[PDB]
């Protein structure tokens, strides 16, 4: 049979911020730029203690639009939750919640029709 699905971005490597392939490393850099530029640390305090990244991602497309900045905001929020986590169970759930968001057909199709993650990595922020 054909090759089964594989992740485009390694979200576990992204959020652990250690070993990363070049594309994931550049997305990480972009995520931190957006985190600082949009003061995400400050707004993050108003989010719930218990992460629900799928809900947050679906909130950010509630108006029916998507763009790479919104994706980087979602990642940056996910990173703040991941950093604040105190168990491997929570960290795994955050990563699984992220993967579930990006595997939704509309999100996946948007990424593929808007230049892929390489185009995200290449934005001049």
Q: Do residues 79 and 35 lie in contact, with contact meaning Cβ atoms separated by under 8 Å? A: yes
Q: b/e for 41-57, b at 16 or more Cβ within 10 A?
A: eeeeeeeeeebebbebb
Domain ranges of the chain: 1-125
* Tokens 């490597």 sit on residue: 13
Which residues is the chain interrupted after (C–N above 2.5 Å)?
Answer: none
Resolution to 1 decimal place, in Å: 1.6
Experimental method: X-ray
CA–CA separation, 120 vs 108, rounded Å?
A: 14
Give, as one character, the DSSP assignment of residue 18: S
DSSP structure string for 32-62: HHHHHHTTHHHHHTTS-SS--HHHHHHHHTT
Query: For 46, how many CA atoms within 13 A lie in the half-sphere containing its CB?
Result: 4
How far apart are alpha carbons 125 and 121 in whole angstroms? 10
Under 8 Å between Cβ of 71 and 116: no
Are 85 and 91 a contacting pair, CB within 8 Å?
A: yes
Nearest residue to 53 (alpha-carbon basis) of 27, 85, 29, 7: 85
d(CA 108, CA 101): 9
């Amino acid at each position: 049979g054909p090759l089964g699905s594989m992740t485009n971005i390694n979200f576990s490597a992204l959020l652990r911020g250690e070993r990363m392939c070049p594309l994931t490393r550049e997305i990480h850099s972009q995520m931190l730029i957006v985190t600082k530029s949009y003061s995400l640390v400050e707004t993050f305090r108003a989010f719930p203690r218990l992460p629900n990244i799928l809900e947050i991602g679906n909130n950010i497309v509630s108006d029916g639009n998507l763009n790479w900045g919104r994706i980087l905001i979602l990642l940056g929020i996910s990173q703040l939750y991941f950093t604040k986590s105190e168990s491997e169970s929570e960290r795994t759930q955050i990563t699984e919640q992220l993967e579930r968001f990006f595997r939704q057909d509309a999100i996946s199709n948007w990424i593929a029709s808007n230049g892929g993650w390489v185009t995200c990595a290449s934005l001049d922020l």
